[PDB]
Every structure is written in C-alpha cells, then in structure tokens.
Amino acid sequence: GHMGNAAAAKKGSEQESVKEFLAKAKEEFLKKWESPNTAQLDHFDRIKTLGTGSFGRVMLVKHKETGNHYAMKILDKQKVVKLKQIEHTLNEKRILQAVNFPFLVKLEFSFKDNSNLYMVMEYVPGGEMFSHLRRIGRFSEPHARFYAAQIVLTFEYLHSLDLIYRDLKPENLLIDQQGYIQVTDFGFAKRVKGRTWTLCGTPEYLAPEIILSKGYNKAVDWWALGVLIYEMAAGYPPFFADQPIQIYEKIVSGKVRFPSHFSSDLKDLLRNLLQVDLTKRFGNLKNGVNDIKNHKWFATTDWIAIYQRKVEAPFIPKFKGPGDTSNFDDYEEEEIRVSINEKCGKEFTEF
C-alpha cells in the first residue's frame, strides 16, 4: 500500500486522538453555547479604521483603564435592516462567544447602545492575508500549504460543532505576530444540523449549490477552501470575471483551468475540492476530512505540529509596538454618532 505498517498504525492512532479531542471540544462548546453587556463605548479610545463594509466598520481601539488594544466591530442597527442581516448578527455574536481554537479570533466584549451593536475582539496586527498576497503576487506552494493546513484544522473543528463558516477569503484571514492565521468575521457562520437555504457569501467563493438555490450543507466550506488554495498559489481565484453574474456562470459550468506552474499534486487536490458533484467532493465523503488531510499535497504537513504552533512560519509581519497599524490599508474616517433615541430595540433584544 502507500504506507507501511509503522506509518499506517501511527496515522490510525492520530485519527482516534482527533476524535477524542473533538468530543471534548464539543462538550466545552455546548456549555458556553447554552450560557451566553460586558463593557461600554466610553471605556475605549477610538484610534483608526481597519476595514469597512456595508453595515459598519472595524476600528482599532484602546481600552482606557488597561491600555490594551482591541479590534472593535461597529454595526449600525438601522443598516442591519434586511431579515437575514439581523439573524446573521445574532449568529455571529453567539458563535464567537462559544468557540475556542488557536486560529479563531477571540471575542472579549460585546454591548449595544441606541444606535449600534459592538463586538470587541483581539487585535491581530499583522494585517489581512489579502494585502500581503496582492503585494507579493502569489505564495509558493509550501507557503500556501502552511496557511491551508490551518484552515483545514479550523473547519474540522467548526464542522464537528455543526457550524458552517460560509465566508472564507483572504480578506477575512489576519496574520498574527508569529505568522499564523486568525479567522475573523463570523457574520455568515451558522449552526446547521443538516441543510440550510440562505443565499449568502462572496461571489468568487460561492459553491455551485448555493448559486443554484439548493439547500446545502458544510461541503460549501470545502469548495471555498479549494478557491482559497487556488487563489493563494495563483494570485487570482479560479472563477474570475468583472461582474457577479459572469462569476456565477463560470462556477456552475464545472471547468477549472490551472497555471502551468501548479504541481500535479496541487491540481489533483483542487479538482477534488472544486467538484460540482457532491457525491465526489472531498470533505463530503465517507472518510470526511481525512481525504483532505491524507492527500499527497499535504504529505509533508505535521498536523499536530501545526495545531500546537510548533512549525516555523514562512512570513513574520513587521511590528513596531503596541497599536501599530502599519500592516493595514487606510480608510475614510467617519464620526461615531449615537442617537438620543433607541433604534430597533425589539429586533435586537437577544444581542
């Protein structure tokens, strides 16, 4: 076979240890999930905007009492107007409260006022994977593999808790001071026991079954991992067009082309992730995540060493001191206005 006796038994024992870990992780998650206003706005100095989207923004803030720095996500309650926009915000807070994994950003406080919802997380100063990737062009395959392995482990953890992530992309992956990944932005994450139906995510990363309005499951995250690995190694994603409608047409076609510099092992992995047929997609078969972890392209990956953060990272961002923002792009700064009247109070009772 491909493995000898010593290797096969080591692998089996490793796989049983993963099961033992995930059983304990699920017990710890459920305790926090069943048992979810830990600060207020004037406890923080607002320093700089780190990113902006349609419903709000993330700012670097400094805690006045401790001097610690954090990333604060601010959501305008009125702008969170659409039905799925509201439910998704409650998902995000509750999931972040309850999870614990070395590559998942840690929530510290959440609170709300008359105008806004707030989530205060750990500040990750090395910047988005997105801007390092665009600056250098593409990552070599060992570099891309080091990040991919962290996503595989993070999805194995989330999916074992029945959580789907649903917004993987380089814009949502921050690089910490040791060069490891921190997944942020759980705005699209959801606990799903079987199928779910919301049409959501980012066009280039959508699985075909989402675009086709089919009920779908956690296998959409494994498709998105194929898109991410392709983009990291190529410098552009596999389904690439100026307008979302054109992107959707390419995704549903079933027709990926690869740069001539991709290794054959990489192409084989990507064909099995970017698989339209759900009866054939890696991550979705009887052997689950192990079809990915045991693929030839990951043969050099020490999965436990990645989890334990024992592996030397390919790139360490430069950091000048606490509250350094040099690894982030600049954004227009807008005043944070809090109305004298409560907005949308009944809609956000649970937050």
């Binding site: 659409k82 997105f130 992309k169 049409l199 980012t202 066009p203 979302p244």
Partner: peptide
C-alpha cells in the same frame, strides 16, 4: 482575463 482585484464584499441575501 479580467476580474475583480480589490477587496470583495459579501452578499447577505442574493
């Protein structure tokens, strides 16, 4: 060919 090179916004519905 041509495609989106800047940051990509997610879509909550549709």
């Amino acid at each position: 060919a041509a495609g989106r090179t800047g940051r990509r916004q997610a879509i909550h519905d549709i």
